[PDB]
Design an enzyme around this catalytic site. Structure first.
Site, PDB file in Angstrom:
ATOM      1  N   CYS A  33     -76.555  -6.651   0.895  1.00 35.34           N
ATOM      2  CA  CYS A  33     -75.225  -6.976   0.391  1.00 35.34           C
ATOM      3  C   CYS A  33     -75.026  -6.418  -1.015  1.00 35.34           C
ATOM      4  CB  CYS A  33     -75.014  -8.491   0.386  1.00 35.34           C
ATOM      5  SG  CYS A  33     -73.767  -9.066   1.561  1.00 35.34           S
ATOM      6  N   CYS A  36     -75.386  -8.914  -3.620  1.00 37.61           N
ATOM      7  CA  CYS A  36     -76.603  -9.615  -3.229  1.00 37.61           C
ATOM      8  C   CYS A  36     -77.515  -9.836  -4.432  1.00 37.61           C
ATOM      9  CB  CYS A  36     -77.346  -8.826  -2.150  1.00 37.61           C
ATOM     10  SG  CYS A  36     -78.538  -9.806  -1.206  1.00 37.61           S
TER      11      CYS A  36
END
Length: 108
Positions: A33, A36
């Site tokens: 991500c 992330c």
């Protein structure tokens, strides 16, 4: 922020992680991500708290030609420390820096 290692690419696995005068700590993030688990001063602050000569930083996301070309951090963010490219230790997600550090305290 001007000093300390972080997002350099090549330079790291170049002569840093294998030429660091001190046992540094490389933190992962995994492309799983964008935003992330990128980084955090919690790892650094506690990376030198037990002294100050220790090092640490986060792998470059720009492409990470090093690790990717070897280690391979396509995901699953782990935590490993090095002091001369000898792969001191490592700990994948699910109690990474905790599992290891817990056994000792941090790096030693």
């Amino acid at each position: 922020a001007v000093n300390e290692v972080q997002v350099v690419n090549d330079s790291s696995w170049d002569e840093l992680v294998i030429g660091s005068e001190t046992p540094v700590l490389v933190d992962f993030w995994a492309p799983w991500c964008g935003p992330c688990r990128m980084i955090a001063p919690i790892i650094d602050e506690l990376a030198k708290e037990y002294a100050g000569k220790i090092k640490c930083y986060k792998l470059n996301t720009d492409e990470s030609p090093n690790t990717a070309t070897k280690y391979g951090i396509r995901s699953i963010p782990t935590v490993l420390f090095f002091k001369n490219g000898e792969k001191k230790d490592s700990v994948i997600g699910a109690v990474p820096k905790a599992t290891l550090s817990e056994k000792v305290e941090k790096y030693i």
